[PDB]
C-alpha cells in the first residue's frame, strides 16, 4: 500500500512585517542580514494562536474533501513549540472547529523543530500498518514567536497542515528511505514560559543521510533528489548548509555549487523568505514551497531534511507528480501570501505591548479585533475571541 | 502478517512514599469520603527526581537485561508526559543519553493529558506493523509527577516503560481492534506552570468500547475479555466505571457485577493503590499489575481502556501469555514497591517547602540529596538516576548506588 500527502497547506499568518524595516527601527546592524536571504516575516495577532494557525492553515483542505473522506480522518497530529497547557493538546481545540469525527485518535508532538516530521512520519505508518484501511491522518505543525534579540526579525509564525492518506499524489514517500539521527545536545531550548545549533545541524544533515544510503543502497545525495528541501530558519544558513553537504558529502568541485542550489534547493525557499522561522513546520512550508515554484512535467523525487534542537533529525524522501502540483495549486498559497497585511513599526509596536495579554498561564482576557482597525475581502478564518478560566473561545469571521 | 506488542515493560514507582491514610489524618478529612476510594499509598518525587530520572529508572532493568544488538534496535523512543520541562526540547534527548542508545533513533514527546501514554504505544505499534524498519524496536516511556484541595493524597508520580517489538510475549496487540474517540471538552487541563471529568471519562469508556465492537464483530464485554485494564486515577472511581460499564454496556444483573469485578478488574488495581495517579501511566501500571497479579496458565486477553482530558480515549486490546508473565516478574514490581523509603509527614511538609527549587522556568539550582538525610543510604539497589543540578536550563543528572 502507498503512502504520503494527499494535500497540504499553509497559512502564514493574518499580518507580517518588513524584516529590513525591523532592523533599521531597531537602530540595528544593517549588514548581519544583508545577505541571510530574509524579506518579510509574519507575525501573530494577539488575537492568534496556535490553534488559529492550524485552523486556518487546515481548512481549506477540509473544504475541499467530501463528507465521505472528512469521516475517514482518524488521526490529528499537532506539532508544536507553541503549547498553551502541559496536557490538553492544542489538537483538541483544532478538533472541534474542523468539526471532525469523533472516531479520531488526536494529541500533540513535540521536539523543537523535529515536531512536524515526528507527526508526519507517525502518520504515515499509520496508513502503512493498514490497522484501519483507507484511513486518513491530518497533521498540522503549527508555532508562533512572542517575546542577544538579533533573534527577533527572523522569527516568525506559521502553520502547514498536511493531508495523509492512501492515494498520495503529491508527495509519495518512499516507505523505509529514512535517516533519523538523535543525541541529546545543549543546543537551544525553550524552557521559560516565552553557534552549537548550527553545528548540530550540519552534523545532523550529513549524519542523516549517511544512515539514508545505509538504508538505501545507491542512493546519491546529487543524482537520487531532483529537489531539496531542508528545515530552513532562514535561507541565508540552508545556502551554506547545502554548500556543506556538496563539497563534504557529495564531494563536487565548488564551481558547480551555484547551480545546483538554484536549480534544487531556490525554489523551496521561496515561501520561507516570506514567513520566516515557522519551527515545526519549516520544513513543511519549504517542501510546499518547492511543490509550487519546481517544475514537475514528469514525477520528481525530493530529499527532506528536518533537524530539531535538542536534538533529533530526520532525512527522508518521496515523488510528487503533475496530478499533485496540480492538486497544490489549487490552494493558491502564494496569493494567500500576497494578501496578508503589511504592519507599519508603530502597529508592530503596539502589538508588542497588547501580546503580553495573551501569555502562557493566561487565565481570563477578552479580545479586542479592532486594536490594529483596519486589518479586519476573503472566506472565513478563526481568530481567538477569549480566556475564561483557562478555556478558549474562538470565533469565524469573514 | 508479523506481530506486534509490548516485550517487555516496568515500572518505576517513586523513590518515597507516603500513607494516603496517615496524610488525611494530618489534614483534617474525612474517613467516609476516602476509605471508599481504594487508596493506600502514593509515590511521591523528591525535588532531586523527575520525569526524565523517573523514566530512566524505569527503562533501565529492561535495557540491562537486552543484549547489546537488541539495545541497537531501539529506533523510537517516546516519551508521553504531562509534566515537561521546555517547550520545545522533549523528555527523550536527556532519557536517550542516560539509557545509552543508539543515535539512529527517532525522539520525541506526546501530549494529551493520560491518553499520551496510550498514544506513544500506538504510534509505536504502528511502526513495528509497518515493517519500515523490520526488527526494529521502540521503547515508549509514560512518566509524570505531581506538583505544589482533596486531589492532594491521590497525586501520585511514576513511570512505566514499555519495550514494544516484534516478539511480544507480555502483550501481543490484536492489530486494529481499536477503539478510539475524542472530542474538545472543557475537561481538567493544566495551563499554570505548576466532575465534567468523570462523565467525560464514562462517555469514552461506552463510545470506545462501541467502536471497537463496530471493527471486531463478537466482541463482547464480558466473554471477550478476561481481564480488564482501566485508565486508573484511583481505584475508586474504576470500581464505579466498571460497574456502569456492566449495566449500561454488558447488561447484566446487578448480583453479578462484583464477582465481575474481583476476578476481572481487581487484580490492575493493586499497584495503583501503591502509587497513586500517574496520568499518562495510570493504563500501563494497571495493565502491569493485571500481568503480575493474575492467573495465565494459559494465553489470556484483556482489555484497556485509555481516557486522556481534554480529550481523547481508546479501547484496545491484546495477549498475554505465560511466558511473558515470566518475563514480567523476573523486573520485580512489587518487591521494588516494598522497598521505598515512607516519609513521614513531618518530612513530607519539608519536602513541600524545597520542591519550589525545581520549578518549571527554573534556570540553576544545585540539589541536596541529603535534605531528607536517610533516603539515599536507605535502598542499597542498582544504581538509579537523580538530578544533580540545574545549569543555564540544562540538567545534569548522576547515578547513585
Not at 94 to 122: D, P, W
Not at 145 to 152: K, L
Not at 159 to 165: N, P, Q, R
Request: proline share 4%; with cysteine.
Amino acid at each position: 500500500v502507498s503512502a504520503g500527502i494527499e494535500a497540504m497547506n499553509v497559512f502564514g499568518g493574518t499580518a507580517y512585517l518588513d524584516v529590513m524595516e525591523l532592523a533599521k527601527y531597531r537602530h540595528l546592524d544593517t549588514a548581519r542580514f544583508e545577505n541571510l536571504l530574509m524579506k518579510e516575516k509574519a507575525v501573530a495577532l494577539p488575537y492568534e494562536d496556535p490553534v488559529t494557525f492550524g485552523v486556518n492553515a487546515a481548512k481549506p483542505i477540509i473544504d475541499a474533501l467530501s463528507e465521505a473522506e472528512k469521516d475517514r480522518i482518524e488521526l490529528l497530529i499537532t506539532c508544536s513549540e507553541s503549547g498553551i497547557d502541559f496536557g490538553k493538546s492544542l489538537s483538541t481545540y483544532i478538533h472541534e472547529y474542523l468539526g471532525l469525527n469523533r472516531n479520531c485518535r488526536l494529541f500533540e508532538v513535540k521536539q523543537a523543530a523535529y515536531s512536524g516530521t515526528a507527526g508526519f512520519q507517525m502518520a504515515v505508518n499509520f496508513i502503512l500498518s493498514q490497522t484501519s484501511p483507507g484511513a486518513k491522518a491530518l497533521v498540522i505543525a503549527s508555532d508562533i514567536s512572542r517575546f542577544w534579540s538579533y533573534a527577533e526579525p527572523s522569527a516568525g509564525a506559521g502553520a502547514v497542515a498536511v493531508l495523509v492518506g492512501e492515494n498520495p499524489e503529491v508527495f509519495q514517500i518512499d516507505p523505509g528511505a529514512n535517516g533519523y539521527y538523535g543525541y541529546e545536545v545543549m543546543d537551544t531550548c525553550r524552557p521559560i514560559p516565552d553557534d552549537l545549533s548550527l553545528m548540530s545541524y550540519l552534523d545532523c544533515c550529513e549524519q542523516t543521510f549517511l544512515e539514508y544510503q545505509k538504508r538505501v543502497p545507491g542512493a546519491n545525495y546529487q543524482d537520487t533528489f531532483q529537489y531539496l528541501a531542508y528545515h530552513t530558519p532562514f535561507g541565508g544558513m540552508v545556502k551554506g548548509a547545502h554548500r556543506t553537504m556538496m563539497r563534504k558529502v557529495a564531494k563536487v568541485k565548488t564551481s558547480g555549487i551555484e547551480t545546483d542550489f538554484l536549480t534544487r534547493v531556490k525554489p523551496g525557499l521561496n515561501y520561507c523568505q516570506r514567513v520566516g522561522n515557522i519551527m515545526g513546520a519549516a520544513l513543511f512550508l519549504a517542501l510546499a514551497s518547492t511543490i509550487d515554484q519546481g517544475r514537475f512535467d514528469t514525477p520528481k523525487r525530493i530529499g527532506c531534511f528536518s533537524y530539531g534542537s535538542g536534538c533529533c533529525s530526520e532525512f527522508y524522501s518521496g515523488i510528487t507528480t503533475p496530478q499533485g502540483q496540480e492538486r497544490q495549486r489549487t490552494f493558491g498559497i502564494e496569493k494567500h501570501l500576497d494578501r496578508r497585511y503589511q504592519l507599519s513599526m508603530e502597529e508592530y509596536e503596539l502589538l508588542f505591548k497588547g501580546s503580553g495579554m495573551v501569555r502562557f498561564g493566561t487565565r481570563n482576557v477578552k479580545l479586542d479585533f479592532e486594536m490594529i482597525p483596519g486589518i479586519m475581502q476573503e472566506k472565513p478564518r478563526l481568530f481567538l475571541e477569549e480566556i475564561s478560566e483557562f478555556h478558549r473561545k474562538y470565533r469565524w469571521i469573514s
